[PDB]
Structure formats: structure tokens, C-alpha cells
Design a protein around this nucleic acid. Structure first.
Lengths: 98, 135
DNA sequence: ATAAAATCACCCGCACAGATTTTTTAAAACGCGCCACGGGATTTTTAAACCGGTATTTAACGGTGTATGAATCCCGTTTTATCTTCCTTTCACTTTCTTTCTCCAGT
DNA sequence: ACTGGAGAAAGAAAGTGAAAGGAAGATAAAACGGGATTCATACACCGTTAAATACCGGTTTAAAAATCCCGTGGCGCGTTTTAAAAAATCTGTGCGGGTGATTTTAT
């Protein structure tokens, strides 16, 4: 993800291009909307999806008195924009687990 | 089950009706999200010509369609000026059952909402049935 | 009786976000006591008003060239007025269980 | 006449479908407050001068500062309460192969 700043008005938005492995996009959007509704994350005004044949595109707009980087870090910490993967390599060798 | 669009002007919006969830997903994955919406259905619909008014009201698919259209029913609060899409397109399968469902939908629209048909807000789509490849 | 289209419960490991639940800690409080501080009555000293005079220092006034205050037009923000709702409640009705009253065949 | 089984009556307790209503939610209309323009108009900066004020030398005197005695309430100590914050412990949930089940329409 990244932050784009308007040349004239100075408003800034967040654009998401890719998502982690084994993540549902609709559930992520619903979770973000639910977090915004209960006032647990501050600095979000608009939220919509614009993915098309070109590629994934998620648009998030911030308020007038907020910093985009802080909101992005909070989204990293609270939502599924970052996930943990536990590696555990087990396979059958000569008919035995190892 | 509705996949609404983003355009707010009703004169620049379209609505598609499909038979089921498989066709609904296939259409959703290949639409234009800006000014196109998809609304699935469930099998064959009730025949309102042989049914009663209370029986029609008690149905579920008819209620969902009425809610999606947002014009009202019963010709008492039914206002034809509250229509939310100025283009309604019927898109069923290319076999005979699609023709049967099309006849049922036409019967419903003509018997219950004549003004929509009179103004010209109903369209019919023509998907293909065969694909031939040589070389 | 042939066709069209749909929906839900549980088992097995593992990692993490969120919701109770103890456990510890700093603030507020109460009782007792003592001495630091302020009131009252003398001595002492000095800050400012008053007469001069002189020597500066400021404010009111007359030209130019801007920066801003009131007015207009919008759009996100928050308030307030206004609809539907699920649990509490009884209550007349219905149902279902328990005891009693005969019949009644047999000897 | 008497006995014991069985069926039918009658009576009392539990489950039931329907009930205002009210706090608890939910959804729209309205009043609000914060930016983009547009200037005319009042405000900022620069030379001139009469006048108002600051300053020095020497009194003075009435008022405030300094000093001593004492008698208290306002801080200080030790020991309890009590919210508040932190650490610890439970609760859900989804990933992918398996077991078994549900519903509505047309003729």
C-alpha cells in the first residue's frame, strides 16, 4: 500500500494493490467498516472498492486533520493487512511421520 | 444478494436479472462496477395470474424484487416516479426454461406495473447458445 | 412424476484478537499532636510629594499604496424530532394428568 | 353377594396464543460551521512640528518597615480504605478433508 497526495487541495488517500496469502477481500472490507463504525480507528471518511480487469484497487480516504501514515500503521496493527505464517514441515518418510 | 453500482443518477444505471447463484457470480466477475448491478433469483417464480394477492405478498422472491425496484406495490402507494433504475434487462439461459421464466417475468411486469412497460424501461438480452471452432 | 434453483450441524491443531478476573498500587481519609506563624503594641527609617528650572521625545497632520472584512456560495457535522421493536405481563383457553364412579362378567 | 378388572366422568394442574407498553433502539429533516472569490475601503509607512513629559538638587514627613511576646489552629506522622491500572486467564474462529442431513416453484 501507499499514500497519494493531491497537488491542489492537499488531501491524501491510501491505495492498496496486493493482499496477503489466503485472505478474503470482502471480509477484510467488512472488518474495516465495522472498526470504523464502532469508532475504534479514527481518521477515515470514505471507503470503496474499484477493482477491475486491470487489477486490484482499494481506495481509503482520510479526514482533514489526520495523518495517513498513522492510519496505515493502525490498519497494519489491527486488521488483516499483516498476518503471521507458521512454518511446520511434516511429511511421511518410509511410512513414518517426521 | 444485490451487487449495487456506484452511479447515483437513475438515468445512467442498469439492472440485470439472472436465474441463479452460478450465473450471478459469472456475471459479477465480468461486469462494469461503475453503472451496472446484478440481482440473482431462485428457480422458477410464482405465476401471479393463477394466484391471489395475499399469496403473492407472502412470497419471498417477489418481495425481494419489489424491494430492489423500490416503487411500491398495490397501486395505492405504488408511485412509478420512484424507480431507481431506468433500464431493466432480463437475461436468462438460452434453453426453453429461460423462455418460460421470461414469460413469467413478462406476465408479472405487465399485470402489476403497467406504467414501467408503457414508458419503455424493459429490455431483453440475447446470449449465445453454441460456440464452433475449426483450426 | 419430471424439471429449475437453493440451505445447515459436527471433528481434528494452531495462532491470535478480544473479553473477564485477580492483584497490586497510589490517592484520599482519620486521629492525635506540637510549634510556625500571625496578631498586637512599641521604635525606626525612607518613598514619594514638592518647589524650582532645563532638555528632550511624542503625537497630531498631510500623501501613497496596499491587505482584509463583509458578503455570497457551497458541502461535510452534529442535533433533534420521529418511526419500529422485544421482553414483561397477564389471561382466558386448551390440553393433559389424576382420582373417582360405576358396569359388569364370573363364581 | 362379593371381587377385581376396565371403561367412562369429573376435576385440577400445566402449556398455550395473544396482550399494552415501554425502554431501546433505529432512521430523516434541520440547523450548524468551515472553506473558495471579490473587491472597496480603511490601514500601514514616510517627512514636520508644538507640546507634553522626564530629569536633577535639596527638604520632609507621614507612613510603612522592623522588633518582641504569645497563643493557637494548620501541617506532619502513622495507619486504614478505595478506586485504578496491570498482569493473568479464558473464548471465538478459520484454514481442508471427512460424517450425516434440509427447502421453494410449474404443469
Amino acid at each position: 500500500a501507499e499514500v497519494e497526495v493531491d497537488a491542489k487541495t492537499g488531501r491524501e488517500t491510501i491505495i492498496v494493490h496486493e493482499i496477503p496469502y489466503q485472505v478474503n477481500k470482502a471480509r477484510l472490507i467488512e472488518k474495516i467498516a465495522e472498526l470504523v463504525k464502532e469508532k475504534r480507528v479514527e481518521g477515515i471518511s470514505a471507503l470503496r472498492d474499484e477493482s477491475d480487469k486491470d487489477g486490484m484497487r482499494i481506495v481509503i480516504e482520510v479526514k482533514r486533520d489526520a495523518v495517513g501514515e498513522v492510519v496505515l500503521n493502525n490498519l497494519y496493527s489491527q486488521t488483516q493487512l499483516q498476518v503471521s505464517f507458521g512454518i511446520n514441515m511434516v511429511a511421511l518418510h518410509h511410512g513414518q511421520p517426521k | 444478494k444485490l451487487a449495487d453500482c456506484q452511479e447515483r443518477d437513475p438515468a445512467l444505471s442498469e439492472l440485470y436479472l439472472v436465474e441463479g447463484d452460478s450465473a450471478g457470480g459469472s456475471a459479477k466477475q465480468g461486469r462494469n462496477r461503475k453503472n451496472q448491478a446484478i440481482l440473482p433469483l431462485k428457480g422458477k417464480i410464482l405465476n401471479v395470474e393463477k394466484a391471489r394477492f395475499d399469496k403473492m405478498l407472502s412470497s419471498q422472491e417477489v418481495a425481494t424484487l419489489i424491494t430492489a425496484l423500490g416503487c411500491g406495490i398495490g397501486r395505492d402507494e405504488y408511485n412509478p416516479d420512484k424507480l431507481r433504475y431506468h433500464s431493466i434487462i432480463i437475461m436468462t439461459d438460452a434453453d426453453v426454461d429461460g423462455s418460460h421464466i421470461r414469460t413469467l417475468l413478462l406476465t408479472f411486469f405487465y399485470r402489476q406495473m403497467p406504467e414501467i412497460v408503457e414508458r419503455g424501461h424493459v429490455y431483453i438480452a440475447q446470449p449465445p447458445l453454441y460456440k464452433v471452432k475449426k483450426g
